[PDB]
């Protein structure tokens, strides 16, 4: 199935931009899925960041970190990157690049169902 | 955001124990609630998606059912090797998790 | 999937492509609307107006409560189970709406515990503490007119005058309310009625209602103008004359491999006459499947089409063959009006019927001529860097299709007549011919 | 007369039956509307506004009086006789309306004997004594605004400001009036214009007009919302600027052996695809004669259909055969949208396409399965006392038809396409095939 | 060109003839509309209402300016030349409107030199000096409500109450504005929006706008009600929140050899049943060429038809043969309703179906009888000086056609059915018969 | 043609309910006609009371006595009954069960014509 | 209610007399006005319905005509055995009768 | 082509009505043209007065002189007349009866083009 | 009314001279502007109609061109026998003329 790898600078100074590129094997990034980032600070749990569509250019971001973040994709290398700005004390975490599954249920009206199944090994960013 | 609560919050059990837990939501979410399987220090996995469907590779002892704002999970005959489980919603952005009770070693 | 080069030669030029989005996953909130103002501060100037008003309003509101009680009396916890024998006859939408009404009854009771607090409100917008964590808002009709106009002028005019003004204001309010809340409302159980229509009980000010409820998003106006924000009546109180409304606020979901394509029509020349193609202007494509769409019910923006439901409708095989290359199956109609368009621009390239309109090359000062064998001309900068059409002077780019566009002809289709009486005439003539052959 | 059991198998489930009622036997009353307010109490703050307003209003009102004079000048007592040569060209409705106008002229003269009393009214609603036994009411536009807003604030603002507010109010009133009373009103002789439209001369407050006239019935709102209450202009006065209106208030007559039957559409399965039947939803039966009805012009209530005229329209023999049992003559259409209904409830019995939707039996916990040969399933309590369909849990009754419903098949009809462009495409292709055969 | 005598025998009686007129040659004028009131005289009673209002209004107005900038940034003097590559895709109407926008930018700059004067206006209607010879008018929304209601009552109510009234007024104004100026407006470059729709930015008072601009003609109301007066947005200012609008005021041109003829339908008898003809009621003739016309988009007066564009549409050869004498090609439909007309008057002569309605001769007291072979009767004064039909008594003139009208028969046409579902049923049956023959 | 017979208690105490049953012969009560009651107090004239439709369940009543009155029909015995409540001093009268004829006249608009042709022998009620 | 008046109110005649009477209405009632035949002590009958139509079994001497609010009845050659007649409306609910003049014995 | 002749009283007293008849040869007055009057006071230029349609009964007049003027046509003699009322000091001029050519230009919208090409000899009116 | 201006206002020339003049309008008039040929004491004539079309019988030296509110006329090689010319509009009622400059003899 789909394999993933996160790459980026291991250690960056505070308030410096962070670029993280997830490279995808075992599948094409132009799939009709969603490629998401999840942040897991040590001593804490998981929290969703955002995604970009595989078959279109639309993007979605978390309200708490929306202003500082950007997401882009590259079909040639099958890699998608996230850019974060103004790194701070709590920004030390592990970053996961995730495939997100969606199901559409029609019963009089429409409800979309989303859940997490497969992620990436993860890498650590130190401020 | 939609807020989730759970009851109870204590799972201290050994091999061969039966439990039931409940997850409540701030409003009705259809069946967009999932019981996950988190793995320490690497990629997690899943137990039940769509609130009633068993994931592959999972023992058939687990069951789930609910409606409206109240959902329930039932477990039997615990094996204490597994570590982490939660109830999660995918109805509204952003996706969030509940407080949770997981397999605990006493 | 569509053959744009062949279609441009019968006057169907490529337009803008748009995304496809549908509403889903609503978030619900409750609000109270009281349909009678508080007249405590002018109690000596009311006469017999309020009793007559209450009689009329009770007559209006009684059947709505009667219609709700049918589902409220025949639903109970086992999920929840409805009694089919008592209900008798219903659609699927009505049954689902009844389930939703039963779900809302609990918060209805919690709010109804504050009846005396509801009856005492003296402002247009008031907040009340339903619980230590939850609040409920009350909107009162005509209260602003009472507080701002009638009360401050008590001694300036006589009591009879104040009473007459109040009577007129209430009668006007009823005149505006009756279209939405009168006998036209035979099925209140549903949840398909728009918030704009619901807000007629508050003078049509839906902006204030939505702002007080606290909704916020970037797609707010798109959701409003696509008729995607709805409300449902959950409880009617006939002694205090108020209603409780639940508001549904959804999000927009994009359909992954779908798009809507627009076509721009242009007249063309054939056999010393002018013609136009009879083909739908908007085409829906989903996973390489082509269909029609009832786009008049949706909102069209610059980047997407926004609908409150799936509006796809089927297409015939002949039309599908028309759109994929067989231009001899595309019908056409004769042009007799001077208002039909004669040219268009697509990707910086001009398509024009240079027989109906004069075309000139600005760069060389020479005329651009179209023969009687051609339908229309493609004009780009390999032949005309800047073109003049009547008033308009326009500079052009380069075409991305075949270099031999203007030397290769097309096969034409059969004429039709789309007038409504002409349809009956043609059907009758065809039946007569069919009988004559037999 | 209709074959409901056969129709339910092609997705046409039996709905509610309703009565048929039409307006008749009107009662007439007269009322005066003055289209200019009295400014006696602020005469020093008017400037030159009133003269310009009167010029504009005279320009609006002159052609209406011109249109009335044609019938008024050419009608006299012999019954009453019209002069056809002078009239020239007219419909039957116009001629009957002219007879009514001549009938109303007597009370018009009696009311016009009070011109100086009409000119002096200073309230929105005034009563005057036409005779010792008969009274007449006067309604004056914008008088409430003059009496309640501009007069009480005379010294608080400057005179020029008062003049500007009055100018703006009059201009807004005209902006609202011109849609109804402008050049669109080319035929004022008739009596088909609704009271709601007429009341634009009084700010759109028809409730006050009807209340002052004194009408009172149990069918009041049903008559209002069916557009059954009309009015006719009888006299125009261009020096005092007022009109006289006669209001017609009818009763409702029930047609004895007639009813309207509703059908609820549900999708069904055939040959690994989903289909819907193309059949009218409302059917009129009168003395065992079946026809269509243009129900969009009527008011639909829970027990009856209420119309201001007879709206029956004819039906083809093929469709009449469809509704009486020959299901192979009923056309059908392919389903490509997810919004089409998939089940319904009738007389406590469920009809459902359990191929598109998942069905379970709650009583036994077992699945309810439909084969590829069946169109849809009937579910009642001989097999499933309580059923589960998605979210819904419902308890069911007993069917009153054949015990062998689910083991007997039906004969299907031919596909069609109902899109407007597809109609032209199909007609063209059929004509080409007819020519090719010959 | 039409055969009126033959047509009257199938119930199509000659009506009124009308002229044909279309708008042309507009005159242009500019005007400023400011969408925020001045609150200087109540500055201590505003709270945080104005900041929130400005955020909302900026959100509304930003995309309109974005859409204008596309054409403004890509147009310059050589006439004027557009850059097609930057524009990409457009219709002819959009390109012409862009040329007009570029033409208007010069006066836009001259007016924008007075920004600080615009921001200080404190009345609803203000005049400013653009040049020693040229003036520009400013209209401010909600200023009358501020100046006449809220300011004069400052001390009578509390500050919070004043703030709440202002908040409600602004929200109602936005609720009325959003339908016209919201996401529905995806193409602001055009110049086809009516002045009535544009005046929603000034509360819907288009009469004041047109009066201040100074337009004055005899065809004023005809131009208003035919939707011939339009406006175009030329500039949007987002820091002062105002717009500049150019108004186009045309004249009416009469087409020389054209007219529109009306037909009045009457039922007739054939084979012991009642029938009506299915033929269009309005026919356009231009230089002896006959066509249809989409008259629902035009204004109909007693002397002419007034349209904002040419609305002629084509007609089939069979229908043209019907109207010129071949009555066997005119289809017909069965009558099942009691509301269909049964007689009419043309040039002082009566045409009546005296089988459905009872006819008497008043002069001699004798009955007027129609046999089962006749369709309808012509009645004039060679046989009946005065006729009685139900209630109506009418005196008649002399016919100008053939003396043998009532002894000569006609050839009838084939029945049809015009119901929408019946069209699909008939098409399906015809296709099945065509397959059966083959 | 149609024969009719009014039956009921000859004498009833004041303020006691009065039930009057009219039995119909020579025709069916399910006819497309109207069955009405007419009251004729001695020393006075006639006055209409109300009716019920033969072919439907609709009813109509006089405004002056609407609150106290009820009308019902029985197809099995072909009998229609009137119920009057709170009998008073003036309620002594003769009650007629009558057949009402209706005609519909279409001339541009609709007018319904109603008149009395056939009545019943009549009985007397004493308070 | 619609109110009816009649003029005149005196009918004292013997065999061989001709009379004309008028019935007026509060407003127009079309032709929904009938001249009845009331019978003492039993079921009454009818003279003219729909304001111009003769009932069966009635001498052809009687005639009726009217319009709008005014209607008229004409009688010739009286036979004084008959007793009671009236003008009645069926245009509006409830149905009402006019004052009336009937055959009277002097 | 079209020939024209203006005829009328050479000298008229002030404030007396002036009737001017233009007789047309070389064509029919029922043509699809416009027949206009132009006034040229000596020492001054040209001024349009009005017209009547050849193929219809419509008319058009100058706003400055509208109240005093009337125009009529006669097909039998092919002559069109103008009537002017209340002649004054400045009304001394030479009157021309002219044909006006009209062209209709369709380009998205409609524009009508009007110009003068053919006039008549002209006669002088003295007050 | 629509007002027209011209520039310049002096035309004093002999055989063999080239000139250009401009006519300006109060607003845009399309191409409804014509350069006329007025003849003294009799019926006038025309030079250019529709702002760019040469009248028959006119020397081909004359040319005209314009847009919006500004239009221009160009003349070469004068013959001083001709007398009078003007710019005129037929866009709005009533039809009016500009100030003008014509052939003048010095
Ligand atoms: C089935 O429904 C009918 C309808 O009311 C009812 O009479 C019957 O008792 C029911 N039978 C069972 C077994 O539920
Ligand atoms: C019949 O009508 C014509 C039409 O006006 C009239 O000229 C003629 O005199 C009339 N004849 C009779 C006998 O009434």
Numbering used by the authors:
A (entry chain G), F (entry chain I), H (entry chain H): 1 to 127
B (entry chain F), G (entry chain D), I (entry chain E): 1 to 106
C (entry chain B), D (entry chain C), E (entry chain A): 27 to 104, 112 to 471
What does the paper say about this structure?
The structures of the 1D6 and 5C8 Fab complexes with NiVBD sF‐trimer were solved at resolutions of 1.99 and 2.22 Å, respectively. In the Ab‐Ag complex, 5C8 bound to a quaternary epitope that spans the DI and DIII regions of one protomer and the DII region of another, mediated by CDRH1‐3 and CDRL3. The three Fabs attached to the waist of the F‐trimer at a nearly horizontal angle, with each Fab rotated by ≈38° relative to the trimeric axis of F. The epitope of 5C8 encompassed 17 residues, with 4, 4, and 9 residues originating from the DI, DII, and DIII regions, respectively, burying an area of ≈976.1 Å2. 5C8 employed a hollow‐filling recognition mechanism analogous to 1D6, characterized by dominant CDRH3 insertion into the F‐trimer central cavity, albeit penetration depth comparatively shallower than 1D6 CDRH3. The Ab‐Ag interface comprised 10 H‐bonds, with three key antigen residues contributing seven of these interactions. Unlike 1D6, hydrophobic interactions played an important role in mediating the strong antigen binding of 5C8. The CDRH3 of 5C8 harbored a cluster of hydrophobic residues. Five (W100A, F100B, V100C, L100E, and I100F) out of six paratope residues from CDRH3 were hydrophobic and penetrated the central cavity, establishing extensive hydrophobic effects with the complementary pocket formed by F protomers. The relatively low position made 5C8 and 1H8 closer to the F‐trimer central cavity.
HNV invasion relies on a series of spatiotemporal sequences involving the attachment glycoprotein (G) and fusion glycoprotein (F), including G binding to ephrin‐B2/B3 receptors, G–F interactions, and virus‐host membrane fusion triggered by F conformational changes. Compared to the asymmetrical and flexible G‐tetramer, the F‐trimer shares a more conserved sequence and compact structure among species of the genus, facilitating antibody recognition of each monomer and increasing the likelihood of cross‐reactivity. We determined the cryo‐electron microscopy (cryo‐EM) structures of the NiV F in complex with the two most potent cross‐neutralizing antibodies (cnAbs), 1D6 and 5C8, revealing the pushpin‐shaped paratope structures and hollow‐filling binding modes. In summary, we propose that the tight dual‐protomer recognition and hollow filling mode of 1D6 and 5C8 enhances the rigidity of the F‐trimer, making it more conducive to locking F into its prefusion structure and less sensitive to viral variations.
